[PDB]
Amino acid sequence: MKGFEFFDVTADAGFWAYGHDLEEVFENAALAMFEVMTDTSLVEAAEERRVEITSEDRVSLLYDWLDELLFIHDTEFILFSKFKVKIDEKDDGLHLTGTAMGEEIKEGHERRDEVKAVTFHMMEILDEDGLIKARVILDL
Incomplete structure (x- = not known):
């Protein structure tokens, strides 16, 4: 039910996220950092923001998905944030669209x-039993 599992690293910390439709793992990755970076469990949603990404390797989408969160985080360091993701296979590449609400x-x-910081912690997506899992480790 959790769909997330973190391991104890020295210096860094990486969480594991699970999917359901590929998009599930990517957005779930953001929660890993937020869930530990703060306590969103209190704020509903006063604002909304959308992000767009272009990937061409799936696994890289994660590396670029969370990294994207790194910049926006300071652009709007908020206590709570909802994660919604949109994945669309382009004429050959990949696209990622995510939404975030609760800015204050x-x-x-x-x-x-x-x-x-986030340094190529893992950003690898492993599929088991047809389920997707993502790995993101963070810098001390």
């Missing part, structure tokens, strides 16, 4: 884990 940072934001 407070003076005393709830911080849990501390990540200095």
Whole structure:
């Protein structure tokens, strides 16, 4: 039911996300960081944002999906964020569309884990029994 599992790394920390339709794993990846970076369990959704991505290797979509979250995070460091993803196979490549809601940072934001950056932590998507799983490790 969780669909997410994290391992204990020294310096970095990577979480495992599960899918359901490919798009499921990608958006689930963002929750891994947020769930530990803060406590969204309190904020509903005051704002909404959409992101677009172009991939051509599936596995890379994850590497570029979360990395995209890294930049926007500071562009709007918010306590809570919903994850929705859209994957469309282009005339040959791949496209990723994700939505985020709940933007409103407070003076005393709830911080849990501390990540200095995301360095090719794993960003690998493994499929088991037809299910997709993603791996994202974060820098100390």
